[PDB]
Amino acid sequence: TKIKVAIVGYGNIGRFALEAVQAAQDFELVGVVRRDINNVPEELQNITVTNDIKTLGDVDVALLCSPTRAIKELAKSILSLGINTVDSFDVHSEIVSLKTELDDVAKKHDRVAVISAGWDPGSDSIVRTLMLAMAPKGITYTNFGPGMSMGHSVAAKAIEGVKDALSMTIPLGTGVHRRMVYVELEAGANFNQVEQAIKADSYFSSDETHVKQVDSVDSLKDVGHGVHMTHKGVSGKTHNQLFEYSMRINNPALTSQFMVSAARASMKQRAGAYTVIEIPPVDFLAGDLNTLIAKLV
Amino acid sequence: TKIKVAIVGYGNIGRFALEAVQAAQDFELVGVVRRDINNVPEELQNITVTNDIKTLGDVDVALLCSPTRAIKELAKSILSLGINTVDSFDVHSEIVSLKTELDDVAKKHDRVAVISAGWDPGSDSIVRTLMLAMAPKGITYTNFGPGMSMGHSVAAKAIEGVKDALSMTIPLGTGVHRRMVYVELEAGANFNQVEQAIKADSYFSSDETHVKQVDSVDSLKDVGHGVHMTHKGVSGKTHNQLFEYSMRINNPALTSQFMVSAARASMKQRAGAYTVIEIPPVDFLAGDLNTLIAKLV
Amino acid sequence: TKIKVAIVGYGNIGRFALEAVQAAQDFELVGVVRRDINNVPEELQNITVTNDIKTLGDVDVALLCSPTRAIKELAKSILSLGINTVDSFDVHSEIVSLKTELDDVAKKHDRVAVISAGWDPGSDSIVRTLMLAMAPKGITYTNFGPGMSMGHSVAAKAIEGVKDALSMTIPLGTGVHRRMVYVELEAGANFNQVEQAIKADSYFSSDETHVKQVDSVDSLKDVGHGVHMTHKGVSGKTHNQLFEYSMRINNPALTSQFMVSAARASMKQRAGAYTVIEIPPVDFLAGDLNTLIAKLV
Amino acid sequence: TKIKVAIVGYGNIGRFALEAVQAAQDFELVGVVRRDINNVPEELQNITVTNDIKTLGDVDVALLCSPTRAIKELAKSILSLGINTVDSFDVHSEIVSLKTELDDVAKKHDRVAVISAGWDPGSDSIVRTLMLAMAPKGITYTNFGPGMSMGHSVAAKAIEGVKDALSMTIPLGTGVHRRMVYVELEAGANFNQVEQAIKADSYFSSDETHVKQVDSVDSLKDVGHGVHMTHKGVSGKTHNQLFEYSMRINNPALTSQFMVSAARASMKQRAGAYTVIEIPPVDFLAGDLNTLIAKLV
Amino acid sequence: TKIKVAIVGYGNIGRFALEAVQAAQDFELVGVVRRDINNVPEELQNITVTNDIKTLGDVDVALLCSPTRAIKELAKSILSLGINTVDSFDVHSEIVSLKTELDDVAKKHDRVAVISAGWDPGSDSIVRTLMLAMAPKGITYTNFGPGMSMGHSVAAKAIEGVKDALSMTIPLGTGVHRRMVYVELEAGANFNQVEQAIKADSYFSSDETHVKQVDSVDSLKDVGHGVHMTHKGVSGKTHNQLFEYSMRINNPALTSQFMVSAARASMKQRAGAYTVIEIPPVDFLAGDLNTLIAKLV
Amino acid sequence: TKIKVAIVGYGNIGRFALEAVQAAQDFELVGVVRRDINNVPEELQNITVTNDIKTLGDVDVALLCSPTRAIKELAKSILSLGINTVDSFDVHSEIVSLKTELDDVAKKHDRVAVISAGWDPGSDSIVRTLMLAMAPKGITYTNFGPGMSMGHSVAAKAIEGVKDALSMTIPLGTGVHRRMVYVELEAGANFNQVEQAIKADSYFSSDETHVKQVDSVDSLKDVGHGVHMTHKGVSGKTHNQLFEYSMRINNPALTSQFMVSAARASMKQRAGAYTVIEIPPVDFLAGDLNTLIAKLV
Ligand SMILES: N[C@H](CCC[C@H](N)C(=O)O)C(=O)O
Ligand SMILES: N[C@H](CCC[C@H](N)C(=O)O)C(=O)O
Ligand SMILES: N[C@H](CCC[C@H](N)C(=O)O)C(=O)O
Ligand SMILES: N[C@H](CCC[C@H](N)C(=O)O)C(=O)O
Ligand SMILES: N[C@H](CCC[C@H](N)C(=O)O)C(=O)O
Ligand SMILES: N[C@H](CCC[C@H](N)C(=O)O)C(=O)O
Ligand SMILES: N[C@H](CCC[C@H](N)C(=O)O)C(=O)O
Ligand SMILES: N[C@H](CCC[C@H](N)C(=O)O)C(=O)O
Ligand SMILES: N[C@H](CCC[C@H](N)C(=O)O)C(=O)O
Ligand SMILES: N[C@H](CCC[C@H](N)C(=O)O)C(=O)O
Ligand SMILES: N[C@H](CCC[C@H](N)C(=O)O)C(=O)O
Ligand SMILES: N[C@H](CCC[C@H](N)C(=O)O)C(=O)O
C-alpha cells in the first residue's frame, strides 16, 4: 500500500524531488529516469538510474522534472504505459491547452495527470482561488522574489560579450517587477553596449532593469525565493476586505515537495487531467481523514 | 440555471447572507425562514418571510444562519426535504461527529451538506491544509483578532453585578490570546468583585484578562476581525520554510460570503456531507471552468 | 437640542451621509434634496425626498453631496436661506478661494460654512497641521491608496476605443504614485493604441502608468482606500523626530462621517467660512465637554 | 508682532524649551526664571536669569517648566500679573479640575492659559479626538515606549537597598505595559528582597515587571520615547475602519516644542483656560493663514 | 596553502560543518573524529572516521562539534598536539573562564583557539559590540526564535510521564521569552500533573510556559531559528539613536559556517585564545585583502 | 591614562565630534584646529582654538573633520608630527589607495591611521563583512535614507536659475535610489528649464528624480538619516539564509561618535593604516576587557 514513484528528468528540482520522496513514509522510490545515465552524482550512487521507465518495473506515478518544452510529449507517453504524471509545467498561458491534451490520454489508459503543481503555478493558484471564494469582486496581485529568474538569466547569457549572467526578480508591488542583472564579460567586450543590449532585449524592455558587472556570478546564486499575494475586495456587498499571503522559501525544495503532495492526491482522483484547484486540498496530505479533519478544520 | 437559495435563521450573519446571495448573479433568493415572521427589518420589506421552508416552493440549497446548538437537527430536517445545507458550524471538536450524522441523511435523500464553511472553521481550514501540502513537518499557529468574542461576552454578561459586557480577543502570537473585557455595572455593584469574578471564571482563567468599567458598551462594538496564521517547517528535507497569511475583514460579511461560495460548490458534489477541505477550490467560484483556470492557475 | 440636517445631492457619498446622520443620536434627518425625486432607491423608500430644501421646514445645516463643480453656487444659495453648509470640496488649489467666497455670504446671513471636510482634504489636513505643531522644520509626505481614482477613471473612459475603464492609485512613497488602469475595448479597437493614448494623456503622462485589458471592469471595483503620511523633522533644535499616520478605510463611509462631524462643529462657530484646521477638534464630537476632556486629553 | 516669552522653571524640559524658543523667529526670549540664579549651565551664560518674572519687563506668555505639583499655584500667580501660561501638566485625572481653576483667574485678568500641552497629554490628545471625529463608535488604545519612566524610576529608587534605579516602559499592545527595572544596590543589600519589594510595590504590582542589577544606571539612560495609537471602529454604519499613528521622538524636545506652539496659539484665543483639543490646529503654527491653508488643507 | 581541518564530534552541527568545510575551496577535510566510529551515516561513507585525531596526519585546525561539557578538556588536548581549535561553546557566564584556560595552553604550544564562534555567542556578539561603538550609552536587547530549545527540550523529556518533548522559544521583546512545550505521554500518565510539573520545573518557572499534548513530536521539529537585536541610545550627546538586526536562518547551517570562518581567521592570529570580538572581521573571509576592502568598506 | 585628542577642521561633524569627545570619560579634549580662529560659536567659548596643532602640546590622536579633498595631505602631516589620525573619508573607490599612502607615513613615524571610520564607510562596512562570514555566497544590498545628500544638493545648487537647493535620497530597495530635489529659483527663472536641467545633470540622470519649487529650503533640512542592509545567501550548502540590519539615526552624531571609538582603538594597533574591518571590534570600546566580554559575547 506504498505509493511507487519514478523521478523523470533530474534538473535543479530533481535532487529535491529525491529528498521529498525519501522523506515521505507513504512513498517508495523505484528509480530515476534521465538522458545521461552515466552522470551519477553523490545522492544517486545507490539509486537505479535508467533512460527508460519500463526497466524500473511497477510504478504508480512519475514526477516529471524535465525542461518545460519536454513535459507534454513525455506525460502523454508515461500515461500511455498506465502510470500517473505530476508536473510543475510553469507556462500559465498554456495550462488550459495542456490539461485537455493530457485528459484525452489519461482517460483512455484509466490514469491521472496532475499538471502545474509547483508553487506558481501550484500552491499560489489555490490561494488565488480561495481569495475569490472569500471576496469574488476586487483585485488580486501576485508579487515574486527576491529570487533568481532562470528564463531572464538565459536571455542575458545569450547576448554579445556575456560570458555568464544572473537575473534577480525584485517585487515592487501590484505585480510590477525590477530586474537586477549581474554579468561576467568575455575578454575585451564593451560593458556599455552589453548593458544597453540587455535593457533593449525583449525579455527586459518592459521592466525597470539594472546591470552590474562582477568577477564570479556563481557566488551570487541562492535558490531562496518568495511571493507576497494581496486581495482587496467585496464579501457580498461589504467592501475593503483585506487578504495577504507571504512566504520566504527554498524554491526547488517547495516545488518538489508540492509535486510529491500532488502525486499522493493523483492516486485518489477519477481518470483525467487536473489543475491543483480541481483537487480536494486534503487529498494532498498523508494520514487518517478523520485525524486530519480534527487537526485542520 | 439560477441556484435557488433559502436563508434559514436570521441572526448576525443573516442580514449579510442576504447581501451575499443578492450580490451573486448566479443565485436567486427564494425567501427567508425564521421563528418570528413579524420582526421584518428594512431589507426584508420585499422578501418572502415564512416560518416554514415548504411555502417557498423549489429550493436547491439552504444557508443555515441559526444558533450553533440548532444546526444539527435543522440540517437533518432540510436535507430530508431534498434540499442542500451550508452552515458555519463553529465547534472544531464536534466537526468530525457532525459530518457523519449529516452524511447518513444527505446520502439517504441524495443531497449535499457542506459544514463548517465560515472563515474559521472554513477559509482558514484550507490555508492550514495547504501549509501541510507545502511543508508537512513543522508547526502551524492561528492568531485571532483583534475582534469581538460573542462566547466570552456572554460569559461576562452572566456574572453578578454586570448589566452589559464586551470581550475583545487580542492575538499575542503562537495561538496565545489576551482578553480585554468592558463592563457596565448594575446600580450599586462592587467593581473589584466583578473584575475578580470575571478573571476567576472558567472562560477567562487560562488567559491574560483585563477588565475596564465603561458608560455605553454598545459604542465600543465593531464587527471587524482578523487572523494571522504562520507555518515554519520542512519541504522534503529542507528546513526553515516560512509561510504566513493575514486578513483584516468584516466578520459576518466574510462568514456569509463563504457560505454562498460553499452553496455554489454543494451543487457539484456526489451526495454526502463535506468539510471545505474535501471540495475542489474552483467549485466555490462562478464562471466558465476554462476562463477561471486561465485567470487563477 | 437635536441638530436638524438636510442631505443636498445624493451621489456616491449621498447614501453614506444618510447612514452617518441616522447613526448620530444628536442629529434629526429632516430630508434628502435632489434633481430627480422619482429615482428612489431601497434606503429612501421611507425618507422625505424633495427637489427644494424650503419644503423641509426648519433646517440647521445642509450636507452638500453634489459634484465638485456645483458646490460653490449651491453653498451660496443655502447659506442665503439662513442654513449652515458642510462640503467635502476636494480641489486643494481652490480651497483658499472657496473659503472667502463663502465667508462673505456666511457672515451676511449670520451662518457657518465648513468646507473641504472629507479625509483629504479634511482629517489628513489636521494631522498635517499637527505635524508642523510638533516639528515645524522638516518634510511631510502624503501617500494615497491602494484605491479607486474617479478623476483618472473618467480620463481613461474618455479615450478612443475604451468601453469602460478603472484607474487604481498605488503609493510608491514620498508622494510618488503608480497608476494601474483596467479597460474594456469597443468591438474592434486596437489595444496598443488605447494603451499608448492613455499613457500619453495629460492625466497619466507624469506617472508610472500600466494598462491591462479585462472582461468586466465592475468586478474589480472596491471603495476601500488608504493613506500613509510621514513627517521627519526638528522639534526646537532636535533633529530626526519621526511621525507617521496610516488608515485602511471605506472611502465614502469616512468622507460622509467626517462631514456629519463638521456639521456638529458648524453649530458652535462664529459666522463665516472655515477649513477644518480652523475648528477646535472637540467641536466635531458629541457629548458633555467635561466627559470628553476626561476621556481624550 | 514678536511674541515675548519667559521660561519659568528650568528642569529637564527647561533646556529644550530654551532651544524651541530660540529656534522660532516669531518669538523673543525675554529671560529664564528659577529658584537658584547662580546655577548657570553652559547655555544660560548669555541669557537673563532672574528669580522673579517682574524683572523681565513686558512678557506676553510664560512656559511653565516646573514640577507637576507646582503648576497650579504658579499659573494662577503669573496669569494674575496679566501674562499667558502654557504648561505640560501630565496628570490626566486632574486636567478637568485644573482647567476650571485656571479659567476663573485667566478670565478675571483677561489672559489665556493653555494646559496639558506636551505630547500625552497634548499632541496625542488631538489625534485621539480626530479618531472619534472619523469613527465615533469602536475602541482607541495608546501604547507608550520604549521609553524612560521618571515616576516609576523614583518609586524604585525609594525602596530599601536601592542606590540608583531606572524603570523602562515597554508597549505590549491594547494599552498593556511591561516594566523593565535596572538597579544599583547599596554595599551589602539582598537582591532577591529588593526585586520582590519592587514587584510588590503599588507602582509595579499591576504590570509584568522584570528587575536586573547593573553597575552604572546612568549609561542605560536615553530620552528617546514613542507612542503607537490605534482606533478600530465605525464611520456612520460602516465597520472595521482602521486608524493608526506612531512616532519615535526625543521626549523633552517634543514636549517643549509643542508648548512653544501652544504659546503661539494662546495669543489668538478669547480669555480663559483651554486643553489643546479646544484650540484650532492652525493657531499652533507660524506664518500667513492663506499660505498655511494652501500648504496643509 | 589549503587549510587542513578535522571535525571533532559529529552531533547536529557535525553534518553541517562537513558541508561548510566541503563548500570552502580554501579548506581540505582531513577527516571526522567521534566516540562511535561504526555509526557511519550516508555523507561519511567516503570520509576517514577515527576516534583519535593523530590517525589523520597533518591537521592545521579542529572544529569541536562535541557536547558543551566536553569542549574544555578536548580543546586543551588538541591544542597540545599543536592543532588550532574553533568551538561554538554556548555558556556566556563561563566564556571569560574558558578563554584564559585555553590561552595558557594555546600560548605554550604556539597555536590559536577561537571560542564561542557560533551565532550567539558568535555573530551576535560582534553586532552587540558594534552597537556600543556607535552609541555607548543606552540599552541593547537580544530576542531569540521562534526556534527549538535543546536545553529546555531535555528538561521537559526528563519529567515523570513524558515519553518525548519539544520546547519552542518565542520572542516577546526586551529579552523576555514565551516557552511552547509539546509532549507525548507514556501509556497511562496524567496530563494535568505533567503540565503542572513542567511549568513548576526550574528551567520554565521564570517564563510564560504553555504545554500541549501531541501524537508525533518529531514531525513538529524544524532547525529554523532567528534573532531580533535592538539598541536605543546616545551617540556622543545625541539621544534616540535606533539600531536593529534580524535574521531568519537555519540554526546548525549558520553555527557551522561561522566556525569555518573562525577557523580561517585562527590561522592569522598570534598564539592565544580569543572571543570573536577580539578578531579583525576581515580575517574571517577568504580572498585578496585589497579586493575584499574594495567590495566591503 | 586619558586619551588626548585634537579636532582638526570644524565642519558639520566638527560640533558633534566635540560632543562625542566631551561625553567619553576616557578622552581629554586638548583643543580645536581650524583655518578661521575668529569664528568661535557657542560651544567653543572655553575651548583652545588654534590654526596650528603644535600649540596644543601633547596630542595622542587627531579627529580629521576637514573636507574630503583635504584628508590625505592633512593626515600625512599630522602622522608626521607623531600623532594618530581618524577620518570618515567617504569615497569607497579610493579607500584602498588612501590606506597605503597613509600606511607608508604611519609606519615611518610609528603611529596609527584609522580611515573611513564613519557609518558608511565605517559601521556598515563591519556589518557587510559579518554577512559574508555568516553566508559567503549570495547578494548584499545597502539602502540609504531617507536623508539629505550634500553632494547632490551642491550639484543642484550649481545649475542656472537655482538660488538654493536640497536633494533628499530615498531608498527603493536593491541599492536603487529616488532623488527628491527642492529648489528656490532666482528672480525671473523658468521652473520647467531648471527641472529639466537638474534631471539631465550627470549627478541625477541615472536615478528617478523629482523636482519641486519651494519658499524656504532651509526649513526642509533634517540631519536624520538611515540604512537598511540585506543579505540573502548560503551558509555552507544551506540556501535562503536571511540577514537584515536597519538604523534611524542622526547622521553627524553617529559619524563623529564612531570616529571617537576608532580613535580609542587606534591607541592599541601596531603602526600602520587600517580600515575598520581590520580592527578587533572590542578595541573600539572603553572598559575592562573581561567585563566587556562577560557583557557582550
Ligand atoms: N518553479 C516555480 C517558478 C515560479 C516563480 C516565477 N514566477 C518567478 O518569479 O521566479 C514554480 O512554478 O513552482
Ligand atoms: N528560476 C525559477 C524562476 C523561473 C522564472 C523565470 N523563468 C522567469 O520568470 O523569467 C525557477 O526555476 O522556476
Ligand atoms: N464565527 C467565526 C468565528 C471566528 C472567531 C473565533 N475563531 C475566535 O476569535 O475565537 C467564523 O469562523 O466564521
Ligand atoms: N464573535 C465571533 C467570535 C466568537 C468566538 C467564541 N468562540 C469565543 O471565543 O467566545 C463570532 O460571532 O463567532
Ligand atoms: N474625495 C476624497 C479625496 C481623497 C483621495 C484623493 N486625494 C486621491 O488621490 O485618491 C476626499 O475628499 O476625501
Ligand atoms: N478620489 C476622488 C476622485 C479623484 C481621484 C484622484 N486620484 C484624482 O482623480 O486625482 C473620489 O473618489 O471622489
Ligand atoms: N511627560 C510626558 C508624558 C508622556 C509619557 C507617559 N504617558 C508615559 O507613560 O511614558 C508628556 O506630557 O508629554
Ligand atoms: N513620563 C514622565 C514621567 C512619568 C512616567 C510615567 N510612565 C509614569 O511615571 O507613570 C516624564 O518623563 O516626565
Ligand atoms: N547554537 C546557537 C544557540 C544560541 C541560541 C540560543 N540562545 C537559543 O535561543 O536557542 C549558537 O550559539 O550559535
Ligand atoms: N537548540 C539550539 C538552542 C539551544 C538553546 C537551549 N539550550 C536553551 O536555551 O535552553 C541549539 O542547538 O543551540
Ligand atoms: N558621510 C556619511 C555618508 C552616508 C550617506 C551616503 N552613503 C549616501 O547617502 O549616499 C557617512 O558614511 O558617515
Ligand atoms: N549628507 C550626507 C550624504 C552625502 C552623500 C553624497 N555622496 C551624495 O550622495 O551626494 C553627508 O554629509 O555625507
PDB file of C-alpha atoms and ligand atoms in Angstrom, chain D residues 12-13 68 90 119-120 144 147-153 167 169 179 203 225 251-252, ligand 8:
ATOM      1  CA  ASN D  12      14.732  68.563  32.123  1.00  0.00           C
ATOM      2  CA  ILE D  13      12.375  70.261  29.552  1.00  0.00           C
ATOM      3  CA  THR D  68       3.815  68.828  38.300  1.00  0.00           C
ATOM      4  CA  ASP D  90       0.749  65.484  32.832  1.00  0.00           C
ATOM      5  CA  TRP D 119       2.646  65.077  23.661  1.00  0.00           C
ATOM      6  CA  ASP D 120       0.462  62.987  26.112  1.00  0.00           C
ATOM      7  CA  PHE D 144       3.812  54.071  25.203  1.00  0.00           C
ATOM      8  CA  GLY D 147      10.965  54.995  26.993  1.00  0.00           C
ATOM      9  CA  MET D 148      12.233  56.030  30.477  1.00  0.00           C
ATOM     10  CA  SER D 149       9.546  56.426  33.239  1.00  0.00           C
ATOM     11  CA  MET D 150      10.559  59.152  35.814  1.00  0.00           C
ATOM     12  CA  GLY D 151       7.545  58.309  38.094  1.00  0.00           C
ATOM     13  CA  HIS D 152       8.368  54.532  38.262  1.00  0.00           C
ATOM     14  CA  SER D 153      12.172  55.264  38.391  1.00  0.00           C
ATOM     15  CA  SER D 167      12.202  51.935  35.007  1.00  0.00           C
ATOM     16  CA  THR D 169       8.121  51.295  29.813  1.00  0.00           C
ATOM     17  CA  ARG D 179       8.195  47.433  33.121  1.00  0.00           C
ATOM     18  CA  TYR D 203       3.664  51.409  41.175  1.00  0.00           C
ATOM     19  CA  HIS D 225      10.370  57.679  23.630  1.00  0.00           C
ATOM     20  CA  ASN D 251      10.752  63.206  24.706  1.00  0.00           C
ATOM     21  CA  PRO D 252      11.674  66.658  26.168  1.00  0.00           C
TER      22      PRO D 252
HETATM   23  N1  LIG G   8       6.946  60.216  31.522  1.00  0.00           N
HETATM   24  C1  LIG G   8       7.032  61.269  32.515  1.00  0.00           C
HETATM   25  C2  LIG G   8       7.172  60.703  33.931  1.00  0.00           C
HETATM   26  C3  LIG G   8       6.107  59.682  34.261  1.00  0.00           C
HETATM   27  C4  LIG G   8       6.459  58.326  33.653  1.00  0.00           C
HETATM   28  C5  LIG G   8       5.186  57.510  33.543  1.00  0.00           C
HETATM   29  N2  LIG G   8       5.374  56.193  32.946  1.00  0.00           N
HETATM   30  C6  LIG G   8       4.736  57.334  34.941  1.00  0.00           C
HETATM   31  O1  LIG G   8       5.525  57.593  35.873  1.00  0.00           O
HETATM   32  O2  LIG G   8       3.578  56.928  35.104  1.00  0.00           O
HETATM   33  C7  LIG G   8       8.228  62.146  32.258  1.00  0.00           C
HETATM   34  O3  LIG G   8       9.156  61.766  31.503  1.00  0.00           O
HETATM   35  O4  LIG G   8       8.239  63.241  32.859  1.00  0.00           O
END
